[PDB]
Symmetry: C3
Subunit: 156 residues, 3 copies
């Protein structure tokens, strides 16, 4: 009986590789972020965290209080999940939506699903990921950055 | 126990008429798309499809594999729905949110609801549609395109 | 068994103070709107209203039909809620997501939660609020306006 929503973006810049949903995808530009700018996992975390009312992943700091920072989005997701289960919550299902003009996400979706399903400890049927463009409109339309929205559903 | 989320946009261009939620709305510009750029139904489909974990409407191709393409958003929605029920899923409720500076959506909402309620086979009380502008900000603020977000809830 | 989604934005302009989630936050610019441009509550209302299928807060008019207009977002939220309960609906949980480059929302979240929890009559554990930026991208990236997304979950 708990719904959750997350949103997140990151601007392009830097050298090559970008990481999304935990997968390393080839691309001319890279993603600027304090950590691996995995917008997919950040949005997913915020969603999960939002449903359990623990307030975004930002509560997990950019203060790098000797514990969390210097850690990829995957570790933060597992950590946040560990705290959510602590409040006796169990995963119902999650849906992620990546918004980018490029690169093509479709081929990497399955592997993303494998990762998320591992970190949240569940089967892949409980996690869905899709991608969409903004038809060359917006900061996404241009290759300025990538955005991602995620909804989550937890059970008690 | 299944939540779903969808997002979708389309840029303006072309002659007159635009189609949204299945309704033909008068407007100076038109919507550029491979098929009738019905952002409302596409977002709705992705949402429904996301909850049943079948990965966006794009999995239904733009490869036009002799079967699906040359078909309006309404047919795709009914098809996707047919496949979702196949996995023993039944509709709970859906909410659509259209983001456009113009034209005015409010008057066409009721008819949109009729269409969606037909295609998904349910009563109108299980489908809600609303509209909002971006106060002349963004590619939506300008008359560059229309975007739409949709959430869905399926039951087993 | 009812999900709901809301979205809303407002452009900057005017003198000082902005109101978000019912809290008065210090800021160089202000928010242009027919009423206190509380994007957080508007998105929240639309969400709640969407789940009960009553079609956005705009159905509550900008026609100022002697009843509603000249009223802050807080009164509209309580009113909309009063009508939702009328249809025998009860609150399950809600999650809000504020998208702004500035000002910093994090410190005001707790108080926002207090307000929402009062207006909807429930405990704070049933209401979550978070904030995020667009890394200086988009009309939000620039200080052009503030946007906000909200999901809601109602029970019968
Ligand atoms: N307007 C904003 C935007 C983001 N934030 C906060 O800063 C943190 C990280 O924001 P970003 O994800 O945008 O970098 C979060 O904890 C969030 O609550 C804020 O307090 N006010
Ligand atoms: N960055 C992106 C954006 C869209 N896509 C894919 O292309 C298809 C259609 O995208 P559009 O709706 O943006 O036209 C979808 O199946 C989607 O998964 C992608 O693989 N990578
Ligand atoms: N394209 C649009 C955008 C908003 N609207 C309507 O106008 C009202 C308020 O819109 P804003 O929140 O964007 O100011 C709502 O009731 C909404 O349904 C519309 O009818 N068509
Ligand atoms: C650790 C954080 C904050 O520094 O990494 P970030 O790269 O900056 O990404 P962010 O979008 O800001 O989301 C919050 C955190 O993941
Ligand atoms: C058939 C598709 C893909 O060609 O039609 P499109 O018009 O292109 O619209 P789209 O947003 O890309 O959503 C996917 C499909 O509906
Ligand atoms: C009363 C309304 C409509 O005038 O106030 P607004 O300030 O204009 O804000 P809005 O975004 O348009 O949301 C609808 C209503 O809250
Ligand atoms: Mn991020
Ligand atoms: Mn589309
Ligand atoms: Mn508003």
């Amino acid at each position: 009986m708990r719904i959750g929503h997350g949103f997140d973006v990151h601007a392009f810049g830097g050298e090559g590789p970008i990481i999304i949903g935990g997968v390393r995808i080839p691309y001319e530009k890279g993603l600027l972020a304090h950590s691996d700018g995995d917008v997919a996992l950040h949005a997913l975390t915020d969603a999960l965290l939002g449903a359990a009312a623990l307030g975004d992943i930002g509560k997990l700091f950019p203060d790098t209080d000797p514990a969390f920072k210097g850690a990829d989005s995957r570790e933060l997701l597992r950590e946040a999940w560990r705290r959510i289960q602590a409040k006796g919550y169990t995963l119902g299902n999650v849906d992620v939506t990546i918004i980018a003009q490029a690169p093509k996400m479709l081929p990497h979706i399955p592997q993303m699903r494998v990762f998320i399903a591992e970190d949240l400890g569940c089967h892949m049927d409980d996690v869905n990921v899709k991608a969409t463009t903004t038809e060359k409109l917006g900061f996404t339309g241009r290759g300025e950055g990538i955005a991602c929205e995620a909804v989550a559903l937890l059970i008690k």
